[PDB]
Amino acid sequence: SQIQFTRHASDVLLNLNRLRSRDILTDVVIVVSREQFRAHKTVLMACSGLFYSIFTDQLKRNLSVINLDPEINPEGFNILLDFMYTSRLNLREGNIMAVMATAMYLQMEHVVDTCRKFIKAS
Amino acid sequence: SQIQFTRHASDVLLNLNRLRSRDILTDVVIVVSREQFRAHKTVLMACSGLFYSIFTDQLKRNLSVINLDPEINPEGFNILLDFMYTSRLNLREGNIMAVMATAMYLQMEHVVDTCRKFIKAS
Numbered sequence: 001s002q003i004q005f006t007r008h009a010s011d012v013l014l015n016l017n018r019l020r021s022r023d024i025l026t027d028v029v030i031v032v033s034r035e036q037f038r039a040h041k042t043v044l045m046a047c048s049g050l051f052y053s054i055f056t057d058q059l060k061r062n063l064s065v066i067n068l069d070p071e072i073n074p075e076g077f078n079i080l081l082d083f084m085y086t087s088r089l090n091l092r093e094g095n096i097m098a099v100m101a102t103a104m105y106l107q108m109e110h111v112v113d114t115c116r117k118f119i120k121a122s
Numbered sequence: 123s124q125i126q127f128t129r130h131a132s133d134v135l136l137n138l139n140r141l142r143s144r145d146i147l148t149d150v151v152i153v154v155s156r157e158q159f160r161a162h163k164t165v166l167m168a169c170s171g172l173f174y175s176i177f178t179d180q181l182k183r184n185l186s187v188i189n190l191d192p193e194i195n196p197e198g199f200n201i202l203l204d205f206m207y208t209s210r211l212n213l214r215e216g217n218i219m220a221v222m223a224t225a226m227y228l229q230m231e232h233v234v235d236t237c238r239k240f241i242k243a244s
Protein backbone atom coordinates (compact mmCIF):
# COMPACT_ATOMS: atom_id res chain seq x y z
CA SER A 1 0.00 0.00 0.00
CA GLN A 2 3.07 2.20 -0.38
CA ILE A 3 3.00 5.50 -2.24
CA GLN A 4 5.01 4.93 -5.44
CA PHE A 5 7.42 7.61 -6.65
CA THR A 6 7.68 6.91 -10.37
CA ARG A 7 10.68 9.15 -11.09
CA HIS A 8 12.74 8.28 -8.01
CA ALA A 9 14.84 5.45 -9.49
CA SER A 10 15.77 7.52 -12.54
CA ASP A 11 16.59 10.50 -10.28
CA VAL A 12 18.87 8.25 -8.23
CA LEU A 13 20.60 6.90 -11.34
CA LEU A 14 21.12 10.43 -12.70
CA ASN A 15 22.70 11.49 -9.43
CA LEU A 16 24.96 8.40 -9.41
CA ASN A 17 26.11 9.39 -12.89
CA ARG A 18 26.83 13.02 -11.75
CA LEU A 19 28.92 11.43 -8.86
CA ARG A 20 30.82 9.39 -11.45
CA SER A 21 31.40 12.54 -13.51
CA ARG A 22 33.01 14.21 -10.45
CA ASP A 23 34.87 11.09 -9.41
CA ILE A 24 33.07 11.13 -6.04
CA LEU A 25 33.24 7.72 -4.14
CA THR A 26 34.35 5.81 -7.30
CA ASP A 27 36.21 2.70 -6.06
CA VAL A 28 37.50 0.94 -9.22
CA VAL A 29 39.24 1.69 -12.49
CA ILE A 30 38.33 -0.59 -15.44
CA VAL A 31 41.21 -0.90 -17.88
CA VAL A 32 40.27 -1.65 -21.49
CA SER A 33 43.30 -1.84 -23.87
CA ARG A 34 44.85 1.67 -23.66
CA GLU A 35 41.92 3.34 -21.86
CA GLN A 36 40.79 3.66 -18.26
CA PHE A 37 37.20 4.20 -16.96
CA ARG A 38 36.51 4.93 -13.24
CA ALA A 39 33.21 3.67 -11.75
CA HIS A 40 31.30 2.61 -8.62
CA LYS A 41 31.55 -1.22 -8.13
CA THR A 42 27.95 -1.20 -6.73
CA VAL A 43 26.62 0.16 -10.08
CA LEU A 44 28.77 -2.31 -12.05
CA MET A 45 27.43 -5.21 -9.93
CA ALA A 46 23.89 -3.95 -10.35
CA CYS A 47 24.14 -3.94 -14.15
CA SER A 48 26.44 -6.81 -15.21
CA GLY A 49 26.65 -10.54 -14.59
CA LEU A 50 30.39 -10.39 -15.10
CA PHE A 51 31.01 -7.60 -12.59
CA TYR A 52 28.55 -9.11 -10.11
CA SER A 53 30.40 -12.44 -10.23
CA ILE A 54 33.77 -10.72 -9.83
CA PHE A 55 33.02 -8.44 -6.88
CA THR A 56 30.61 -10.70 -4.97
CA ASP A 57 33.58 -13.02 -4.40
CA GLN A 58 35.45 -11.94 -1.28
CA LEU A 59 38.65 -12.85 -3.13
CA LYS A 60 38.08 -9.93 -5.52
CA ARG A 61 35.67 -7.66 -3.75
CA ASN A 62 38.30 -5.08 -2.72
CA LEU A 63 40.14 -4.91 -6.10
CA SER A 64 40.69 -1.24 -7.16
CA VAL A 65 41.75 -2.18 -10.76
CA ILE A 66 40.12 -4.65 -13.21
CA ASN A 67 41.73 -5.40 -16.54
CA LEU A 68 39.21 -6.54 -19.12
CA ASP A 69 40.03 -9.08 -21.83
CA PRO A 70 42.38 -7.53 -24.46
CA GLU A 71 39.84 -8.24 -27.30
CA ILE A 72 37.18 -5.98 -25.70
CA ASN A 73 36.45 -2.91 -27.80
CA PRO A 74 36.90 0.29 -25.72
CA GLU A 75 34.14 2.14 -27.59
CA GLY A 76 31.77 -0.74 -26.97
CA PHE A 77 32.65 -0.78 -23.31
CA ASN A 78 32.16 2.97 -22.99
CA ILE A 79 28.73 2.73 -24.64
CA LEU A 80 27.70 0.07 -22.15
CA LEU A 81 29.14 1.93 -19.13
CA ASP A 82 27.14 4.98 -20.15
CA PHE A 83 24.09 2.74 -20.56
CA MET A 84 24.54 1.44 -17.00
CA TYR A 85 24.43 4.97 -15.64
CA THR A 86 21.68 6.40 -17.91
CA SER A 87 19.28 3.67 -19.22
CA ARG A 88 20.12 4.94 -22.71
CA LEU A 89 21.81 2.74 -25.28
CA ASN A 90 23.59 4.38 -28.23
CA LEU A 91 23.09 1.55 -30.78
CA ARG A 92 24.05 2.21 -34.45
CA GLU A 93 25.03 0.14 -37.52
CA GLY A 94 28.67 1.16 -37.15
CA ASN A 95 28.87 -0.07 -33.54
CA ILE A 96 26.27 -2.78 -33.15
CA MET A 97 28.56 -5.85 -33.52
CA ALA A 98 31.10 -4.38 -31.01
CA VAL A 99 28.32 -3.42 -28.53
CA MET A 100 26.67 -6.89 -28.82
CA ALA A 101 29.99 -8.76 -28.30
CA THR A 102 30.83 -6.49 -25.31
CA ALA A 103 27.36 -7.02 -23.79
CA MET A 104 27.74 -10.81 -24.13
CA TYR A 105 31.06 -10.58 -22.27
CA LEU A 106 29.62 -8.29 -19.59
CA GLN A 107 26.58 -10.58 -19.28
CA MET A 108 23.94 -7.85 -19.93
CA GLU A 109 21.07 -9.95 -21.38
CA HIS A 110 18.54 -7.17 -22.23
CA VAL A 111 21.18 -5.29 -24.34
CA VAL A 112 22.26 -8.53 -26.14
CA ASP A 113 18.55 -9.21 -26.92
CA THR A 114 18.14 -5.56 -28.08
CA CYS A 115 21.20 -6.04 -30.38
CA ARG A 116 19.50 -9.18 -31.82
CA LYS A 117 16.34 -7.09 -32.43
CA PHE A 118 18.38 -4.32 -34.09
CA ILE A 119 20.03 -6.89 -36.43
CA LYS A 120 16.55 -8.37 -37.22
CA ALA A 121 14.88 -4.94 -37.81
CA SER A 122 17.71 -3.98 -40.13
CA SER B 123 18.35 9.05 -30.53
CA GLN B 124 19.25 6.49 -27.87
CA ILE B 125 17.18 3.39 -27.23
CA GLN B 126 15.50 3.92 -23.85
CA PHE B 127 15.30 1.05 -21.36
CA THR B 128 12.32 1.99 -19.21
CA ARG B 129 12.89 -0.56 -16.44
CA HIS B 130 16.67 -0.21 -16.16
CA ALA B 131 16.81 2.42 -13.39
CA SER B 132 14.37 0.48 -11.21
CA ASP B 133 16.33 -2.75 -11.88
CA VAL B 134 19.51 -0.99 -10.78
CA LEU B 135 17.88 0.35 -7.61
CA LEU B 136 16.50 -3.09 -6.75
CA ASN B 137 19.95 -4.60 -7.13
CA LEU B 138 21.49 -1.85 -4.96
CA ASN B 139 18.94 -2.72 -2.29
CA ARG B 140 19.79 -6.48 -2.52
CA LEU B 141 23.52 -5.41 -2.07
CA ARG B 142 22.51 -3.46 1.03
CA SER B 143 20.61 -6.49 2.33
CA ARG B 144 23.81 -8.58 2.04
CA ASP B 145 26.04 -5.82 3.35
CA ILE B 146 28.03 -5.88 0.09
CA LEU B 147 30.21 -2.68 -0.47
CA THR B 148 28.29 -0.70 2.23
CA ASP B 149 30.69 2.03 3.44
CA VAL B 150 28.85 3.84 6.28
CA VAL B 151 26.80 3.12 9.38
CA ILE B 152 24.12 5.72 10.26
CA VAL B 153 23.49 5.83 14.00
CA VAL B 154 20.02 6.97 15.07
CA SER B 155 19.50 6.93 18.89
CA ARG B 156 19.98 3.25 19.85
CA GLU B 157 19.86 1.84 16.29
CA GLN B 158 22.34 1.41 13.47
CA PHE B 159 21.62 1.25 9.69
CA ARG B 160 24.38 0.34 7.16
CA ALA B 161 24.19 1.91 3.66
CA HIS B 162 26.08 2.97 0.53
CA LYS B 163 27.13 6.68 0.78
CA THR B 164 26.55 7.03 -3.02
CA VAL B 165 22.83 6.12 -2.57
CA LEU B 166 22.53 8.43 0.46
CA MET B 167 24.08 11.31 -1.54
CA ALA B 168 21.80 10.56 -4.47
CA CYS B 169 18.65 10.81 -2.33
CA SER B 170 19.26 13.42 0.41
CA GLY B 171 20.39 17.04 0.55
CA LEU B 172 21.78 16.43 4.02
CA PHE B 173 23.88 13.39 3.07
CA TYR B 174 24.99 15.03 -0.19
CA SER B 175 26.25 18.08 1.72
CA ILE B 176 28.03 15.91 4.28
CA PHE B 177 29.88 13.53 1.97
CA THR B 178 30.64 15.93 -0.90
CA ASP B 179 32.90 17.79 1.54
CA GLN B 180 36.36 16.23 1.49
CA LEU B 181 36.47 16.85 5.24
CA LYS B 182 33.76 14.22 5.74
CA ARG B 183 33.79 12.16 2.59
CA ASN B 184 35.63 9.18 4.13
CA LEU B 185 33.61 9.03 7.42
CA SER B 186 32.49 5.42 8.14
CA VAL B 187 30.04 6.48 10.95
CA ILE B 188 27.46 9.32 10.98
CA ASN B 189 25.50 10.10 14.10
CA LEU B 190 22.19 11.75 13.33
CA ASP B 191 20.59 14.37 15.61
CA PRO B 192 19.29 12.72 18.84
CA GLU B 193 15.70 13.98 18.14
CA ILE B 194 15.45 11.98 14.87
CA ASN B 195 12.88 9.21 15.08
CA PRO B 196 14.46 5.82 14.17
CA GLU B 197 11.24 4.50 12.60
CA GLY B 198 10.99 7.62 10.47
CA PHE B 199 14.58 7.26 9.38
CA ASN B 200 14.11 3.59 8.51
CA ILE B 201 11.03 4.41 6.42
CA LEU B 202 13.01 6.99 4.47
CA LEU B 203 16.07 4.73 4.04
CA ASP B 204 13.79 2.06 2.61
CA PHE B 205 12.23 4.71 0.36
CA MET B 206 15.69 5.66 -0.95
CA TYR B 207 16.33 2.08 -2.01
CA THR B 208 12.84 1.21 -3.32
CA SER B 209 10.89 4.33 -4.52
CA ARG B 210 8.14 3.23 -2.12
CA LEU B 211 7.05 5.37 0.79
CA ASN B 212 5.18 3.74 3.70
CA LEU B 213 3.12 6.80 4.77
CA ARG B 214 0.36 6.30 7.41
CA GLU B 215 -1.52 8.45 9.96
CA GLY B 216 0.46 6.93 12.82
CA ASN B 217 3.82 7.84 11.26
CA ILE B 218 3.24 10.84 9.04
CA MET B 219 4.45 13.59 11.43
CA ALA B 220 7.68 11.61 12.22
CA VAL B 221 8.30 10.84 8.50
CA MET B 222 7.70 14.51 7.50
CA ALA B 223 10.03 15.88 10.23
CA THR B 224 12.72 13.30 9.26
CA ALA B 225 12.37 14.16 5.55
CA MET B 226 12.78 17.88 6.35
CA TYR B 227 15.98 17.08 8.24
CA LEU B 228 17.27 14.80 5.46
CA GLN B 229 16.33 17.44 2.87
CA MET B 230 14.11 15.14 0.73
CA GLU B 231 11.73 17.72 -0.84
CA HIS B 232 9.38 15.37 -2.80
CA VAL B 233 8.62 13.32 0.39
CA VAL B 234 8.04 16.51 2.48
CA ASP B 235 5.62 17.74 -0.26
CA THR B 236 3.93 14.27 -0.31
CA CYS B 237 3.54 14.51 3.53
CA ARG B 238 1.88 17.96 3.04
CA LYS B 239 -0.49 16.36 0.47
CA PHE B 240 -1.27 13.48 2.85
CA ILE B 241 -2.13 15.97 5.65
CA LYS B 242 -4.32 17.97 3.17
CA ALA B 243 -6.11 14.84 1.77
CA SER B 244 -6.83 13.69 5.30
Ligand SMILES: Cn1cnc2c(c(-c3ccc(O)c(C#N)c3)cn2CC(=O)Nc2ccncc2Cl)c1=O
Nearest residue numbers: 045046047048049052107108109110111130137140
Ligand atom coordinates in the same frame (compact mmCIF):
# COMPACT_ATOMS: atom_id res chain seq x y z
C1 LIG C 1 22.39 -11.79 -17.50
N1 LIG C 1 22.57 -10.88 -16.40
C2 LIG C 1 23.26 -11.37 -15.26
N2 LIG C 1 23.48 -10.53 -14.13
C3 LIG C 1 22.98 -9.17 -14.20
C4 LIG C 1 22.32 -8.68 -15.29
C5 LIG C 1 21.99 -7.34 -14.93
C6 LIG C 1 21.29 -6.25 -15.70
C7 LIG C 1 20.63 -5.25 -15.02
C8 LIG C 1 20.04 -4.23 -15.73
C9 LIG C 1 20.14 -4.20 -17.10
O1 LIG C 1 19.55 -3.16 -17.84
C10 LIG C 1 20.83 -5.20 -17.75
C11 LIG C 1 20.96 -5.21 -19.23
N3 LIG C 1 21.09 -5.25 -20.33
C12 LIG C 1 21.42 -6.22 -17.05
C13 LIG C 1 22.52 -7.14 -13.66
N4 LIG C 1 23.08 -8.25 -13.26
C14 LIG C 1 23.75 -8.41 -12.00
C15 LIG C 1 22.88 -8.83 -10.86
O2 LIG C 1 21.88 -9.50 -10.97
N5 LIG C 1 23.37 -8.33 -9.60
C16 LIG C 1 22.83 -8.66 -8.32
C17 LIG C 1 22.19 -9.89 -8.10
C18 LIG C 1 21.76 -10.18 -6.81
N6 LIG C 1 21.98 -9.33 -5.79
C19 LIG C 1 22.61 -8.17 -6.00
C20 LIG C 1 23.08 -7.81 -7.27
CL1 LIG C 1 23.92 -6.32 -7.54
C21 LIG C 1 22.08 -9.57 -16.48
O3 LIG C 1 21.52 -9.18 -17.45
Ligand SMILES: Cn1cnc2c(c(-c3ccc(O)c(C#N)c3)cn2CC(=O)Nc2ccncc2Cl)c1=O
Nearest residue numbers: 008015018167168169170171174229230231232233
Ligand atom coordinates in the same frame (compact mmCIF):
# COMPACT_ATOMS: atom_id res chain seq x y z
C1 LIG D 1 15.95 19.06 -1.53
N1 LIG D 1 16.87 18.05 -2.00
C2 LIG D 1 18.25 18.35 -1.95
N2 LIG D 1 19.22 17.42 -2.40
C3 LIG D 1 18.73 16.14 -2.89
C4 LIG D 1 17.40 15.83 -2.95
C5 LIG D 1 17.38 14.52 -3.52
C6 LIG D 1 16.22 13.59 -3.81
C7 LIG D 1 16.34 12.65 -4.80
C8 LIG D 1 15.31 11.76 -5.03
C9 LIG D 1 14.18 11.83 -4.25
O1 LIG D 1 13.12 10.94 -4.46
C10 LIG D 1 14.09 12.77 -3.25
C11 LIG D 1 12.89 12.88 -2.38
N3 LIG D 1 12.02 12.98 -1.71
C12 LIG D 1 15.13 13.65 -3.02
C13 LIG D 1 18.70 14.15 -3.72
N4 LIG D 1 19.47 15.15 -3.36
C14 LIG D 1 20.91 15.12 -3.41
C15 LIG D 1 21.50 15.56 -4.70
O2 LIG D 1 21.01 16.36 -5.45
N5 LIG D 1 22.77 14.91 -4.95
C16 LIG D 1 23.64 15.21 -6.04
C17 LIG D 1 23.68 16.49 -6.60
C18 LIG D 1 24.62 16.73 -7.61
N6 LIG D 1 25.49 15.78 -8.00
C19 LIG D 1 25.47 14.57 -7.44
C20 LIG D 1 24.56 14.26 -6.43
CL1 LIG D 1 24.54 12.69 -5.68
C21 LIG D 1 16.38 16.83 -2.49
O3 LIG D 1 15.22 16.60 -2.51
